[PDB]
Amino acid sequence: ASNYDCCLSYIQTPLPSRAIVGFTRQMADEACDINAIIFHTKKRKSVCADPKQNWVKRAVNLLSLRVKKM
């Protein structure tokens, strides 16, 4: 096992969604072989955070209802 070369660079530091302005979902196939969360904080470029965290899943969660009509 080893860290892949997903987006620019994996989320070297998982920050709270309180600093996440925007984000998107990243599929496992392209430059990434795994799932990652293309974060777009207000003080950090496109961040790639694997959807296996509490902070990530929290940000992706609000999105799960956002990118899913109900």
Curated annotation (Swiss-Prot):
Q: Which UniProt keywords apply?
A: Chemotaxis, Cytokine, Disulfide bond, Inflammatory response, Secreted, Signal
GO molecular function terms listed in the Swiss-Prot or TrEMBL record: CCR6 chemokine receptor binding; chemokine activity; cytokine activity
User: Which cysteines are disulphide-bonded?
Assistant: C6-C32, C7-C48
Coiled-coil ranges (or none): none
**Gene Ontology CC terms:** extracellular space
Does the keyword Disulfide bond feature in the UniProt annotation? yes
Q: In which tissues is it expressed?
A: Thymic medulla (at protein level). Prominently expressed in the small intestine, colon and appendix. Also found in thymus, spleen, lymph node and lung. The long form might be dominant in intestinal, and the short form in lymphoid tissues. Expressed by IL17 producing helper T-cells (Th17).
Instruction: Supply the induction statement.
Output: By lipopolysaccharide (LPS), TNF-alpha and interleukin-1. IFN-gamma alone showed no effect, but potentiated the effect of TNF. Induced synergistically by TGFB1 and IL6, which requires STAT3, RORC and IL21.
What does the record give as the function of this protein? Answer: Acts as a ligand for C-C chemokine receptor CCR6. Signals through binding and activation of CCR6 and induces a strong chemotactic response and mobilization of intracellular calcium ions. The ligand-receptor pair CCL20-CCR6 is responsible for the chemotaxis of dendritic cells (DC), effector/memory T-cells and B-cells and plays an important role at skin and mucosal surfaces under homeostatic and inflammatory conditions, as well as in pathology, including cancer and autoimmune diseases. CCL20 acts as a chemotactic factor that attracts lymphocytes and, slightly, neutrophils, but not monocytes.
Q: State what protein this is by name.
A: C-C motif chemokine 20
Species for this entry: Mus musculus (Mouse)
- Give the shown range, full length included: 28 to 97 of 97
